[PDB]
């Protein structure tokens, strides 16, 4: 069994660029590199940007902590 | 804990506003630690509906937005425990 905490750790190590689907927010997503995280599934994202469906335009954020409650799914590149 | 306070309000007559706009006016028979609340002599007024009078009502505490307390209710007395 691959277990979800490890797979996040894998994403961390690889410095993979992660895209997050948001909880109850369907228009925005967020993507960035997972520098760190915790038990609550809060993420530290290194080069984060906020991506909107209608615009196809991306707002640059820098280094962010995103609270866990929001996440609905974690994706690659 | 501050529900400890609400649990002291038995026999007090209050007005409760619910997260869904329902307003309850009644007399508190008991409040429990999850803020679940029991009332007697109730006038429940669902959002945009005519009031309805009820002998009794219990409210699951998560649904409470606030209690409106009697103008005279002695807060300092009641807040010491």
């Amino acid at each position: 069994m691959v277990q979800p905490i490890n797979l996040i750790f894998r994403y961390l190590q690889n410095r993979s660029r992660i895209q997050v689907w948001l909880y109850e927010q369907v228009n925005m997503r967020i993507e960035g590199c997972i520098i760190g995280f915790d038990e609550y599934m809060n993420l530290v994202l290194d080069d984060a940007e906020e991506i909107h469906s209608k615009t196809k335009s991306r707002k640059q954020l820098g280094r962010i902590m995103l609270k866990g409650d929001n996440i609905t799914l974690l994706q690659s590149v | 804990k501050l529900v400890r306070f609400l649990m002291k309000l038995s026999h007090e007559t209050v007005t409760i506003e619910l997260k869904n706009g329902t307003q309850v006016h009644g007399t508190i028979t008991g409040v429990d630690v999850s803020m679940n609340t029991h009332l007697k002599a109730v006038k429940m007024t669902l959002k945009n509906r005519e009031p309805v009078q009820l002998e009794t009502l219990s409210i699951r505490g998560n649904n409470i937005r606030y209690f409106i307390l009697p103008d005279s209710l002695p807060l300092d007395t009641l807040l010491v425990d």
């Binding site: 967020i30 530290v44 954020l61 962010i64 902590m65 | -």
Partner: protein, 74 residues
């Protein structure tokens, strides 16, 4: 960088200007003063940005942790 995690990330940010974005669309900018194990935040010299552009200047602010979407430096 090491694995840089949430608690020490914020502890980094404390003292510095920060911007916090709420689940409900408003954002609050100001000097992160404190945070707790639930990640409630106190801000100072706080200002309110509604829909991206500045709305007004507020003051000392508590933000209840459930409301926060993300928080970021300056």
């Amino acid at each position: 960088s090491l694995p840089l995690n949430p608690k020490p990330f914020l502890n980094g940010l404390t003292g510095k200007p920060v911007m916090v974005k709420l689940k409900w669309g408003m954002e609050y900018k100001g000097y992160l003063v404190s945070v707790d194990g639930y990640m409630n935040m106190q801000l100072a010299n706080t200002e309110e940005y509604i829909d991206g552009a500045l709305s007004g200047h507020l003051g000392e602010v508590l933000i209840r942790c459930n409301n926060v979407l993300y928080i970021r430096g300056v």
